[PDB]
């Protein structure tokens, strides 16, 4: 189990936190704790500019985590959700599929690496374009965001 539940007050799933190469990440708008005792009180390190949050993965997560991939290759991915495409540098999913409570979600390519993590979506009628975070060769974190993007 390397995706947890961000939970409001209520205990209302918000969105979710992955553990990934030695972190807990989250996108920074997700707010809530999240449900697990070794993660609810870590100390959080927040980037505005990538909408995300992140902390060290407690030692005892030390092998339950994601690994992250820079290879996109245009094709197909997989999230919570169903299929994923990746074409013309963007992610798009079925109008419907994603919404609310999804922000923090990664996308996986079929050996379950982390190809993305996804924020939000615009919707363009039929297709949704996901707004994602990733990271490329050098560890630099990219935001991608398209127009109208609702937060999820």
Do not use: C
């Not at 707010?31 to 980037?47: E, V, W």
């Not at 923090?104 to 939000?120: E, F, H, M, T, Y």
């Amino acid at each position: 189990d390397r995706t947890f539940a961000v939970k409001n007050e209520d205990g209302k799933i918000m969105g979710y936190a992955v553990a990934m190469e030695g972190k807990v990440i989250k996108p920074l708008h997700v707010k809530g704790t999240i449900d697990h005792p070794a993660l609810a009180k870590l100390k959080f390190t927040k980037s505005s500019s990538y909408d995300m949050e992140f902390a060290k993965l407690p030692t005892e997560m030390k092998s339950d985590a994601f690994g992250y991939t820079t290879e996109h290759p245009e094709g197909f991915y997989n999230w919570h959700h169903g299929a994923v495409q990746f074409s013309g540098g963007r992610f798009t999913i079925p109008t419907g599929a994603g919404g609310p409570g999804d922000s923090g979600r990664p996308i996986l390519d079929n050996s379950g690496k982390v190809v993305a993590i996804v924020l939000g979506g615009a919707n363009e009628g039929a297709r949704t374009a996901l707004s994602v975070v990733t990271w490329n060769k050098k560890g630099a974190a990219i935001k991608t965001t398209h127009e109208d993007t609702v937060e999820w």
